[PDB]
């Protein structure tokens, strides 16, 4: 999401999260959901318009920012972004750091993008929440992305967690749920400061995994728990390969050396396992000669 702050007291020492939509920025304007007061001699009463576009689907995958546009409102002393004069018709920016000078004000408004892309585990969940989050500047999606910061698991309806959840946990993504989304549905009209929505996501995550037999204590104890072992699967996606890598496994992807060198087959007279079955073991027992001894029992038998 986009945030602005400034040096000096030109924004009253406060930062602000800017959602998609339009703001009028100026000396004689009151801080509400669509106006930003910036007090300095050389800033016009109504000085600039900032327009933030809503995110595209691509940004969920690239981690790119919402397009940020600046128009100068025919002012006395002009507007610059990153030292470039804003012309008539304005300019648009897709960089993640903008230094915006209004007039001759010696202090710049500093706009920066904080990464936040939300993956959903369920298509009906995505369709219900996507428009809501997009209006906050938060890209969303279903498929795997390297720009994902948060992952929404389905209601753990007294049942097993999905591979998407297991994967998110392991790559150290913050796992959230419905209750945090309900919180986000609260905030569009609000004027709130930098990092306002992030810690609640971490609190949600920490509470989710507490007393939960689908999770161990941390990603750290799961990571490399199967080192020394090796496996094989059919047309492994790079995500499932990375998932198995994170468990410390040696992987051989296929389309006498597939059989006796490889300890088991992961799926979707050889010995086969699902990732779902592998997760059950990856939690269960204690040590490296215990939590990897039940997996070593399933191989010999």
């Amino acid at each position: 999401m986009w945030i602005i702050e400034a040096e000096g007291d030109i924004l009253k020492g406060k930062s602000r999260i800017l959602f998609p939509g339009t703001y009028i920025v100026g000396r004689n304007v009151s801080d509400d959901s669509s106006h930003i007061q910036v007090i300095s001699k050389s800033i016009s009463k109504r000085h600039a318009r900032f327009t933030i576009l809503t995110p595209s689907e691509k940004d969920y995958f690239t981690g790119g920012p919402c397009e940020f546009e600046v128009k100068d409102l025919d002012t006395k002393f002009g507007t610059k972004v990153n030292e470039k004069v804003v012309g008539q018709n304005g300019d648009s920016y897709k960089e993640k750091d903008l230094k915006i000078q209004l007039g001759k004000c010696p202090f710049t408004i500093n706009a920066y993008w904080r990464s936040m892309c939300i993956q959903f585990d369920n298509p009906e969940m995505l369709s219900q929440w996507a428009s809501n989050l997009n209006l906050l500047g938060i890209p969303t999606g279903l498929r795997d992305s390297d720009a994902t910061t948060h992952f929404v698991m389905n209601r753990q309806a007294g049942s097993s967690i999905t591979v998407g959840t297991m994967y998110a946990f392991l790559k150290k993504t913050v796992i959230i749920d419905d209750s945090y989304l309900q919180y986000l549905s609260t905030v569009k009209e609000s004027v709130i400061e930098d990092a306002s929505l992030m810690p609640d996501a971490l609190e949600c995550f920490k509470n989710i995994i507490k007393n939960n037999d689908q999770f161990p204590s941390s990603p750290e104890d799961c990571i490399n728990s199967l080192e020394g072992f090796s496996c094989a699967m059919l047309n492994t996606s790079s995500e499932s390969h990375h998932l198995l890598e994170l468990l410390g496994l040696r992987i051989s992807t296929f389309m006498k050396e597939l059989i006796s060198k490889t300890d088991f087959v992961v799926l979707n007279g050889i010995f086969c396992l699902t990732i779902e079955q592998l997760w059950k073991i990856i939690i269960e027992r204690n040590s490296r000669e215990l939590i990897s001894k039940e997996i070593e029992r399933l191989k010999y038998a």
Partner: peptide, 5 residues
Amino acid sequence: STTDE
């Protein structure tokens, strides 16, 4: 208030 330096 009129804008200046």
